[PDB]
Design a protein around this ligand. Structure first.
Ligand SMILES: *[C@@H]1O[C@H](CO)[C@@H](O[C@@H]2O[C@H](CO)[C@@H](O[C@@H]3O[C@H](CO)[C@@H](O)[C@H](O[C@H]4O[C@H](CO)[C@@H](O)[C@H](O)[C@@H]4O)[C@@H]3O)[C@H](O)[C@H]2NC(C)=O)[C@H](O)[C@H]1NC(C)=O
Ligand SMILES: *[C@@H]1O[C@H](CO)[C@@H](O[C@@H]2O[C@H](CO)[C@@H](O[C@@H]3O[C@H](CO)[C@@H](O)[C@H](O[C@H]4O[C@H](CO)[C@@H](O)[C@H](O)[C@@H]4O)[C@@H]3O)[C@H](O)[C@H]2NC(C)=O)[C@H](O)[C@H]1NC(C)=O
Ligand code: 9A5
Ligand code: 9A5
Ligand SMILES: *[C@@H]1O[C@H](CO[C@@H]2O[C@@H](C)[C@@H](O)[C@@H](O)[C@@H]2O)[C@@H](O)[C@H](O)[C@H]1NC(C)=O
Lengths: 532, 532
């Protein structure tokens, strides 16, 4: 049968799924590691002990234990991101969508979910790999990994909670793909990893980590980069938070051995309930448990690694959305709300700024405010709203991504850069939020092809055009077809720094993506804070 | 006779001078103080001992001892600013242009020359008071004052060189006008002081100094303000330079009494020859001997005086030219020259910046460079040239003037603000220099009325229009005629900060003159340098 597959872990049985007047195969919830339960909460993952018999992979696995957004109960725009299955600590599985008939040795795409390292699910509707699998004849995998404290509690020195274990979950799934994807028609030497937000940063982290580089061929990074200020902490900061988490559960803090035991005794919701109370600053776009710079997974600081060329040299394709900041301002900044235009008083602007740049002193906060205020018109509430949207997006996503790109491009084998600025016609979030963190994903996964979802024709076109760039790039390391008669996404070079915007208009090429602001965030502001 | 006049100092005899198909009276070189020669070099001025007999005031007096520009020997554009009479330490005189027939009690305008407190002459062609006297039926006075070390060597504590004595020369001339101008038809209670550059700052200084406030009624400040960073130093900095000047003439530096004696023994050119070698920084738009903040002439710091309202409350009219920086860049910055377009390499830009902001550390220099560089286009030599022109103008003239205006306007009785941006059609300096420091003066003094000088008709019109604003303002404290049917120069208010541009176009009103840059120079940058 097309749906029975023998792998080095055991036989698996998939399921035939419909997709756009046709059908394909899917293998859902295949285990790649031992459950990380009990005395193994916080531990490195162990490889899954192989099974005799037939693993029923006809239905999605559990999502990992995570915080669940109840800010807009019922609202599709927010629930679409929440777990759609029972949560459990038993959650390390992957899902595979394979063309029909099964190919022999086609391109593989492995999706790594975002969600700030504290949430995410491999099983969400907007991550359904079938439209991509089917339209580009690729094998589309999506893995899962432990988020929150479960994935990222770091007590450096201990082996019981060494930190980074969620990145190790991802790595193990990548090992498994390397070792088994051929049984499904996949070419293990044309594996592309791709990801959004923390997934984007994850991908970049796998490019940096020596122990992950050999497991894949190329990378796509969407709206995330491993050097993002939210994406990692020092081992000391990790420790501080591990401990501080202890204190909120009246735990014994006298040794690592003592704390971890105490933390392992707790129910999962008891950890989720107090996870946000360990952040050292009142802040947005900061997350409690995240990768740590340990000297194991990351042998030195990211910045030193990037200067010296210590990373996988290959092709990458990456970029950003127009209004990355809006989602976090909505959820965490005073003045902003879903059902108004959220025009913003001076006073709430300055509140915004302090929240957006938490590590900054008063001189720093002034420098940021000077950069982003039109002083001819300092009480326009649209301008203050839009200016804060830009501050958050620039500081957290765009400028760090641009810094990664420029450093990568000195040593790599080709870089392709996009700026996604299309607001979907059927978006249910308000207009002021613009082109939002995460809303390119649905184009990448082909959802505008499903008539019932109410995209325009131009939007179906753009999705097809993007699915092709992604798949073609994953196949050849270039998103352009060889001699096509459409216009060419130029390569990004150190000298000229070209990129394209992705939307329904005729493709347009520009150069030096947000360079004015990024010189501020990447050169000036850091200098300013070092001196003071 | 119309040309014989009895004053409290003696009888004076003027001279009938032609002006535009008519004639008027002029009294040139009337002494207002004892020569400041010998044991009186560096001293407070003493009032001129009255004379019996008739003082021949038919010809211009000597100009004061000053440095003489030989950068462009023969070139009209530069020689027009140099002394046109024998220089001497005997130089404290004034000049008076009176309508024919002599009026009884008309408005008086007293001009104070600029030239960085180190040069200037009351007798230059471009300061000929006759066109104004005649066209607006005002009595136009122009005084003179000691520049350089002669005017400004400050050894606080000594009475032999107390500093500020050149400002005291101006004050004495103003005393004399107060006491005698009525004999010439002048109304001593409608005296307007007006000045450019250091003269502008002088005027503002007379508004601040309690001992000068009662001697005049209103003020016009052109491209200068008493808070300009070049316009004054502390008594310690004054001392340091007084001394350092000693050292360059192998003077005995053991006491004030010893140094001054030694400095009084020297010929004037011996002081001029080494005057520039005492500046503490390599710099432009900085001048060696300038007013000092002494607690006598200025009872406290300018900034504290301005916050507390300690100054003359009256009407003022003031403003700036478009390209104030260009003249100093030409004369003192590498890359810039008279006969090319002076496009400017990155490397010469950064040299520019260091020169323009001499008191600044490296973090400061970065902050300035960030503010003024288009990072999309960081090798456009026109943009780097123009950006440096703006840095110098903004930091030295515009932003300090704007800070003065906003502080004055909280406590004063009306403020009128202009932005002069007309490039004269017959300018002999190159185009890149733009609208240059000092080149509104010729409009204010009516030179575009003389056919032989080659102004267009539109330029004659603008000059008439400006002469009228100045004279009407000096007469009533408002530059507008009561019910005229031309458009009104609005008042500058704290709330709305309106100003007009002065040129050949239809008058246009705007608001918040260079406010983006001036928040940088007046708030951010000073904070930045205090913290570091
Ligand atoms: C991604 O990586 C691959 C390689 O890992 C890379 O392809 C390489 O491109 C260069 C282009 O310079 C090729 O180098 C040349 O190859 C020719 C033909 O064999 C040689 O004759 C060349 O030497 C002559 O010409 C040079 C002028 O170009 C002279 O400088 C020289 O003195 C000789 O006269 C030269 O070695 C190279 O062959 C390929 N390699 C492969 C495997 O194709 C590709 O460019 C990379 N892409 C990016 C975007 O970084
Ligand atoms: C694609 O576009 C179409 C057309 O624009 C769109 O169809 C709309 O879908 C919603 C489904 O949510 C329909 O709204 C419901 O209509 C019924 C009958 O009149 C009401 O009872 C419903 O109200 C209940 O639920 C509300 C919460 O939403 C409660 O507030 C309320 O108290 C009730 O319990 C509800 O309004 C809507 O009528 C259609 N419109 C049309 C013209 O068909 C479709 O959803 C789009 N598809 C996608 C996937 O977005
Ligand atoms: N946690 C609170 C504040 C808080 C602080 N302490 C707490 C204690 C208990 C409960 C809450 C708190 C807070 O500010 N949460 C913001 C994060 C909510 C998670 C939703 C993540 N889902 C999204 C995600 C993405 N985009 C989104 C866009 C919008 Cl418009 C909305 C949601 C998106 C893209 C990546 C995947 C997740
Ligand atoms: N003194 C040298 C450098 C120097 C340093 N050390 C020295 C030693 C000896 C000789 C020279 C030096 C220097 O940079 N000088 C610049 C000042 C020259 C004075 C001319 C002042 N005249 C002007 C003045 C004004 N505008 C001008 C516009 C232009 Cl384009 C040209 C001249 C203008 C307006 C106010 C009146 C004076
Ligand atoms: C495999 O399982 C399919 C769906 O599983 C569903 O959930 C599990 C936990 C059970 O409760 C099961 O009864 C549910 O159906 C079944 O539809 C399918 O029949 C099973 N197939 C095979 C080959 O065993």
């Amino acid at each position: 049968s097309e749906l029975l597959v023998n792998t080095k872990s055991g036989k698996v049985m998939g399921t035939r799924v419909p997709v756009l007047s046709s059908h394909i195969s899917a293998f859902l919830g295949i285990p790649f590691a031992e459950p990380p339960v009990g005395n193994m909460r916080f531990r490195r993952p162990e490889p899954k002990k192989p099974w005799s018999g037939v693993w029923n992979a006809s239905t999605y696995p559990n999502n990992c234990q995570q915080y669940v957004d109840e800010q807009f109960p019922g609202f599709s725009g927010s629930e679409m991101w929440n777990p759609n299955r029972e949560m459990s600590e038993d959650c390390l599985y992957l899902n595979i969508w394979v063309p029909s008939p099964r190919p022999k040795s086609t391109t593989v795409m492995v999706w790594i979910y975002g969600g700030g390292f504290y949430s995410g699910s491999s099983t969400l509707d907007v991550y359904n790999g079938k439209y991509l699998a089917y339209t580009e004849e690729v094998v589309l995998v999506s893995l899962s990994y432990r988020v929150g404290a479960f994935g990222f509690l770091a007590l450096h020195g201990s082996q019981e909670a060494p930190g980074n274990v969620g990145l190790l979950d991802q790595r193990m799934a990548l090992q498994w793909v390397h070792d088994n994807i051929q049984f499904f028609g996949g070419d293990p030497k044309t594996v592309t990893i791709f990801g959004e937000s923390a997934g984007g940063a994850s991908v970049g982290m796998h490019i940096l980590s020596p122990g992950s580089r050999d497991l894949f061929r190329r990378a796509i990074l969407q709206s995330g980069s491993p050097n993002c200020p939210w994406a990692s902490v020092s081992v000391a900061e990790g420790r501080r938070r591990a401990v501080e988490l202890g204190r909120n559960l009246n735990c014994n803090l006298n040794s690592d051995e003592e704390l971890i035991h105490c933390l392992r005794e707790k129910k999962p919701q008891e950890l989720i309930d107090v996870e946000w109370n360990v952040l050292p600053f009142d802040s947005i776009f900061r997350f409690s448990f995240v990768p740590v710079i340990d000297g194991e997974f990351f042998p030195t600081s990211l910045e030193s690694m990037l200067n010296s060329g210590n990373f996988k040299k290959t092709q990458i394709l990456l970029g950003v959305n127009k209004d990355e900041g809006s989602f976090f301002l909505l959820y965490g900044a005073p003045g902003f709300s879903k059902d108004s235009e959220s025009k913003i008083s001076r006073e709430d602007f300055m509140s915004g700024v302090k929240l957006s740049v938490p590590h900054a002193n008063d001189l720093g906060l002034d420098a940021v405010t000077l950069q982003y205020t039109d002083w001819m018109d300092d009480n326009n509430g649209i301008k203050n709203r839009d200016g804060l949207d830009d501050i958050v997006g620039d500081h957290n996503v765009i400028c760090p991504l641009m810094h990664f790109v420029n450093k990568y491009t000195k040593f790599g084998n080709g870089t392709y850069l996009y700026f996604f600025n299309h607001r979907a016609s059927n978006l249910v979030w308000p207009e002021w939020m613009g082109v939002i963190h995460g809303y390119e994903i649905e184009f990448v996964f082909g959802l505008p092809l499903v008539k019932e979802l109410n995209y325009t024709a131009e939007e179906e076109a753009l999705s097809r055009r993007i699915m092709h760039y992604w798949a073609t790039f994953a196949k050849t390391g270039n998103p352009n077809e060889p001699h096509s008669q459409e216009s060419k996404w130029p390569l990004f070079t150190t000298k000229e720094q070209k990129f394209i915007d992705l939307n329904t208009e005729p493709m347009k090429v520009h150069q030096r993506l947000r360079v004015q602001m990024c010189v501020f965030w990447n050169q000036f502001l850091p200098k300013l804070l070092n001196a003071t």
